[PDB]
Amino acid sequence: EDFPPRIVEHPSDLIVSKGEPATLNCKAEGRPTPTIEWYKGGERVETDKDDPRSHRMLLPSGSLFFLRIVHGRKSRPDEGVYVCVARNYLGEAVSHNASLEVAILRDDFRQNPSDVMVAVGEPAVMECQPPRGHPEPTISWKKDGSPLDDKDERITIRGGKLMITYTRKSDAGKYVCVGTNMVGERESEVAELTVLERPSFVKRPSNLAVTVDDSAEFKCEARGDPVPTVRWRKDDGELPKSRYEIRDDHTLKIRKVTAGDMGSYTCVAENMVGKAEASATLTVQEPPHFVVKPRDQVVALGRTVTFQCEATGNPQPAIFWRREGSQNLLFSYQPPQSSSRFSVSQTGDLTITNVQRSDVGYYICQTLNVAGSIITKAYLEVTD
């Protein structure tokens, strides 16, 4: 008794790389043994059973076996879908079609990741598209040759993008996009991420007051990435010809300081990412000068006298009074100890009210600051 031929096992679709071996899944039974015929949509295919010189092999189990896939620029007949057919003494059989496409992966990337230059805390985005390949390559990233993961909340690898919400100095490095499939791995062109820092001050110039022909030093020190260029400037005008120097540490030194050196001097730290400035004032000290000097006076007993004494100077000088041959100092802001008939105004004058005979004498006005001291006096004569 003879049974009609029919396909028992159906072959499934599979992809194989160039040169790599591939095997199908075809099986049929009948009486006598059915010969499995392989044809690429009508066209005949060479096998080991038909000719002993052919490269393509034919297994007696039923499934077709290939050693090396024929593909190139001149000849490529191996690629294409094939269906096995069984034939016995009586009856015909046809199996389901299975895809037998050759797998490939190109050399150059459709989109190479680009270099990014950002300041600390600013986001960083890198984009990539792997080379043309079947099956379509899946993206992954590498930082300094080491694989990168989504684990860190700041880094998200979705689609063809690598995202960093805010950068840390630790984010700097050489980034490479990687395209992988069954064929292999493809690394992209190096995309370097540089995390820069704006300039800021390590030391800020401080306010200074000096006397004429002294020296003035203003200190400055900055940080940053790239290392900044520290430069001095005088705001009202220029730095003094033949009289200044900037030391290696960035100190500003003005020798033999004159009145025309009084003002604001700025220190400027600059790099590619930004600029930062810090100012400080120079106060040139001047000794005091009498504006109004007291005049000798004659006053009737019981009446009020006022000896005027006003002084200019930088800084504004302290004025005080005292009677010749006495230690009791009379100030404006201070309550007068001995008598309340004596008082110094906010501007320096000395008012004596209800003058008595013991008030006779010299009243000394003294003005002083850090740059000098000046002293003057006027006589009080008390008459009947």
Domains and CATH numbers, the chain: 6-104 (2.60.40.10), 116-197 (2.60.40.10), 199-286 (2.60.40.10), 287-382 (2.60.40.10)
From edge to edge, which strands make up the β-sheet containing 92-94? 43-44, 37-40, 83-87, 92-94
Q: How was this structure determined?
A: X-ray
Kindly report the CA angle at 64 between 63 and 67, in degrees rounded to 5?
A: 135
Contact 228, 199 (CB under 8 A): yes
Environment class of 124 (CB within 10 Å of its CB; exposed 0-12, middle 13-18, buried 19+) = buried
- Dihedral Cα 348, 354, 358, 363, nearest 10 deg: 10
Residue of 320, 299, 314 lying closest to 377 (CA atoms) = 320
Residue type, 360: V
The 342-344 sheet, strands edge to edge: 305-307, 350-352, 342-344
**Helix, strand, coil percent content, the chain, rounded in steps of 5:** 0, 45, 50
Q: How far apart are CA 220 and CA 239, in angstroms?
A: 16
| CA-based torsion, 77, 83, 87, 91: positive or negative | negative
Contact partners, residue 232, CB within 8 Å, separation at least 6:
218, 220, 239, 246, 250, 252, 265, 266, 267, 268
* Long-range pairs of 355-359 with CB within 8 A, sequence gap ≥ 24: 355/299, 355/300, 355/301, 355/302, 355/303, 355/304, 355/305, 355/380, 355/382, 356/301, 356/382, 357/301, 357/382
Measured CA to CA, the distance from residue 104 to residue 109 in angstroms comes to: 14
CA-CA distance, 84 to 25, in Å (whole number)? 10
* Single-letter residue type at 170: S
**3-class SS of residue 217:** strand
The span from the CA of 174 to the CA of 192, in Å, is 4
The angle at the Cα of 288, spanning 282 to 290, to the nearest 5 degrees, equals 145
